[PDB]
Amino acid sequence: HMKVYLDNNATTIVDPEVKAAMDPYFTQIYGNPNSLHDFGTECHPALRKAMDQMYEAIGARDEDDIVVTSCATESNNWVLKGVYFDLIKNGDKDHIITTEVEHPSVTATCRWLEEQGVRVTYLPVNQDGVVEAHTVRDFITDKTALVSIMWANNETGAIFPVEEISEICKEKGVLFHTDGVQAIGKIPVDVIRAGVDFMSFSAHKFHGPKGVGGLYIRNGHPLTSLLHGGEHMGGRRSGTLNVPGIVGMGKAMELATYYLKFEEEHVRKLRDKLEDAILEIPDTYSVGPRENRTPNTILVSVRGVEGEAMLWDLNRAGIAASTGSACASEDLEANPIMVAVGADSELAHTAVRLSLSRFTTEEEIDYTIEQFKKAVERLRSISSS
Amino acid sequence: AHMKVYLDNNATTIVDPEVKAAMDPYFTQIYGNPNSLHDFGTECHPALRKAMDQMYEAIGARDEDDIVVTSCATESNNWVLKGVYFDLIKNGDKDHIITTEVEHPSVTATCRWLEEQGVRVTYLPVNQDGVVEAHTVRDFITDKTALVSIMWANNETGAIFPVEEISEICKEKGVLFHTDGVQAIGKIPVDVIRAGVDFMSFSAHKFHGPKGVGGLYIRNGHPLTSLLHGGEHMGGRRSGTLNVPGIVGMGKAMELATYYLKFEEEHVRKLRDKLEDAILEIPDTYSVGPRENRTPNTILVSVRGVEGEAMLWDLNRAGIAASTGSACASEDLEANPIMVAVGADSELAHTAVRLSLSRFTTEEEIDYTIEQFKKAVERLRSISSSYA
């Protein structure tokens, strides 16, 4: 029996180097950076270094803005409610396009905007678990204010064609925001190559601390503040800076790009080992194409067994995983398949989500394979099918 | 910097090593998401319950009440103001908010943006004692006032507001009462049912907690449209993954603050009074606000020949960290020159020096600050061609 964490898409471990980078900024260095005295200014070089690491990690340019928020939920709320305020309540627009598979910080915010009279189209997802750019083009009207599509999905790990969608959005002169939380540390992130106007990210998903996130804004494009007040973050987001959070986020982002550039294949190899071994069990289906999937994610549907029961049995075995909604469909020459679906859909059964990190070991994968096969056999012996 | 001395505690505070130790496991040792169902996520749950319990116990909240953990008091203020605007103004029959001219910018600028949305806002000016009295609030409440937002204690003068009396008047009028209570925790007794407030904002980095975490108290879980929508965190009132280290540290820090309250009433007050009396020994110096209504850790002193920003820079060169405060000139009832608080926007406002202590201030820090303060005043008055 060994404890094994494979829920990294939900949250990640803080790299000991990140915690070490953060440590001084609680008790040794505690001044407010907005103070003029030496106590406040002592942390300023660390803040500049952190912001530089962030800009370098996502490929933003000097004209661009990167506002430090409390979480990606704040960033998504900010983008949606601010563009609603700027272009919809005091503009000539009334439409926002998104997908059925967004994070609740996008979906519920869009539903509240719907409650305010905003027309929103929640774009359904294709067989590949993705939304394609031509459907976006077809749904853009002359009143669409913003298109908000996640960069990569948190349940399936499917990567969205963010560059093509950006090209379509620029042709129609409409703003483009992406929830890039699942992208940082897992796929190359270049926000001018992706052409996004806004990007949300969260540090505790690439091994930074919880409680700090960010919103990237191309060229400092106007966006009414969600938090008003002092002139923090260039007057775009008030509230005292989470100095430890900022330092740790910068360090974690730098480390994430470093391990993406060298250790991409170690994590990808372990995911592929786990997925191939699990698919050796009869009547198991991995959701989404791997050649378009983040290197760390598997979403498996097991037949007869229920995803939550599989999670409970794994947790009793010391293995932490999560859920993901999937639906049943047919292919074109290998008919039975499981495809991504909105959690609200009535067609949805629950599949098991296993998400690795650069800290996963091959021993964890061997134990996980063995215990997965044991749990499948055990729960199918007790299954109603 | 002959000796480094921190007297800018009203701006931010050092993290108590016990608070940092309480936080330590929840970065690398305990990292699961508390919203997960597996054991990795649920491992931190008892610490979260204990931290939330410490908060309820520290401010005297009841079980029916709600305490939502935010990212900072700025988030709490934005949330309260914009939410009551959404609830009672854009989808109600109300259109008026009453506040003061001395609020923190997270309240003032939010109110200005709401004015830009058509909300009537009256920024009540402050009296000689540096406070807003309850009868003035009563005089400005109409049947259209949606919310009254008045800070519990001032961050520049430390003056304590009569939040209880204002609450009684608000209850007579059936209007909601919010207080920005950031300056109150750890400095004065905080009892949110005795204060009768409906909302209270607070920020952990003011009472030796970490930066990046705050809270909003809600008296009966009163409806308030979420500032952050999404998952059902904090009872569905503020979504976003929990800042577990921040929450743990905030609970520990608030418990420590209530324990150290008597230390701050007695010893910290004694050191503040030493520093203030020593400074007031300098000719043509004026302390803003009456001490008998002031938090034990705050001084806002006006010097006559000297300029406030130059005085702060000169103190920092001596290793002393302080801040500013806006002040105006007046006379008392005996027609004696005194300095009184004023909104920073007023053209009658000059800059005063703000010195704020903490439970970690030592008497050596106070003696060194007295000496260097007197030296800097003499130096800056010695070069003036105008001082009499």
Ligand SMILES: Cc1ncc(COP(=O)(O)O)c(CN[C@@H](CS)C(=O)O)c1O
């Ligand atoms: C009364 C009051 N209300 C809100 C805040 C802001 O707290 P946050 O957690 O950063 O949002 C503060 C902190 N203001 C600091 C620095 S901005 C001062 O120099 O006085 C405050 O004093």
